[PDB]
């Protein structure tokens, strides 16, 4: 089995309060957390998965643990209200990854961006190459609404990995009615 610590980042931004992902993005991203946490259980027991709130200020109430029981409890009453903040949410998983006791687990991050963010192409390429020096492979999954056919996050994913490095891949989410289990179909198949 592949060894790594997957830190999933829930999206508390104010644009997660609608139902485009059925029935509602609160329960949809919950089901999106349900499918990733149950998949790691089918993958490796040693993988420990925490949660982090990106919007407003970053706070982690659940220590990194393989048990997803406390994670599923925090998915309720998450109160998705606040301003989305991206740049601070990249290393936010990496700092919890620098607190890992075992160093054999690879550094892997999955973040949920459901809101348009104001960012310059020079800011995302500096964080990209910074993760190249840190070897961290971050799989981002587009959620919510954002710049049509997202460029920044795509350039953030594309410039994040290279040769090969298998890798970081971004899947653009269509702005249409769908079930959250149908959104993750492509990303969970091929990261």
Of the CA atoms within 13 Å of residue 13, those in its CB half-sphere come to: 20
Q: Does 177 bind other proteins (CB under 8 A)?
A: yes
* 3-state SS assignment for residue 96: helix
Q: Alpha helix locations (H) across 44-145?
A: 69-74, 91-98, 121-134
Closer to other proteins by CB, 28 or 93: give it.
28
Q: Does 104 bind other proteins (CB under 8 A)?
A: no
Closer to other proteins by CB, 45 or 175: give it.
175
Which tokens belong to 97?
Answer: 């990854």
Q: Does 109 bind other proteins (CB under 8 A)?
A: no
Nearest to 113 by CA among 135, 133, 138: 138
The pattern of x and - marking residues 48 through 77 that bind other proteins according to CB under 8 A reads -----------------------------x
Chain positions contacting other proteins, by CB under 8 A:
15, 17-20, 22, 24, 26, 77, 79, 81, 145, 175-177
């Amino acid at each position: 089995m592949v060894l790594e610590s997957t830190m999933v980042c829930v999206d508390n931004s104010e644009y997660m309060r609608n139902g485009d992902f059925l029935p509602t993005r609160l329960q949809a991203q919950q089901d999106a957390v349900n499918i990733v946490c149950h998949s790691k259980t089918r993958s490796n027991p040693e993988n420990n998965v925490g949660l982090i709130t990106l919007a407003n200020d970053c706070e982690v109430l659940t220590t990194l643990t393989p048990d997803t029981g406390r994670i599923l409890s925090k998915l309720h009453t998450v109160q998705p209200k606040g301003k989305i903040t991206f740049c601070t949410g990249i290393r936010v998983a990496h700092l919890a990854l620098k607190h890992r006791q075992g160093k054999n687990h690879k550094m892997r991050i999955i973040a949920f961006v459901g809101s348009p963010v104001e960012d310059n192409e020079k800011d995302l390429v500096k964080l990209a190459k910074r993760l190249k020096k840190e070897k961290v492979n971050v799989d981002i999954i587009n959620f919510g609404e954002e710049e049509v056919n997202t460029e920044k996050l795509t350039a953030f994913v594309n410039t994040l990995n290279g040769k090969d490095g298998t890798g970081s891949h971004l899947v653009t989410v269509p702005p249409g009615p769908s079930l959250a289990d149908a959104l993750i179909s492509s990303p969970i198949l091929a990261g």
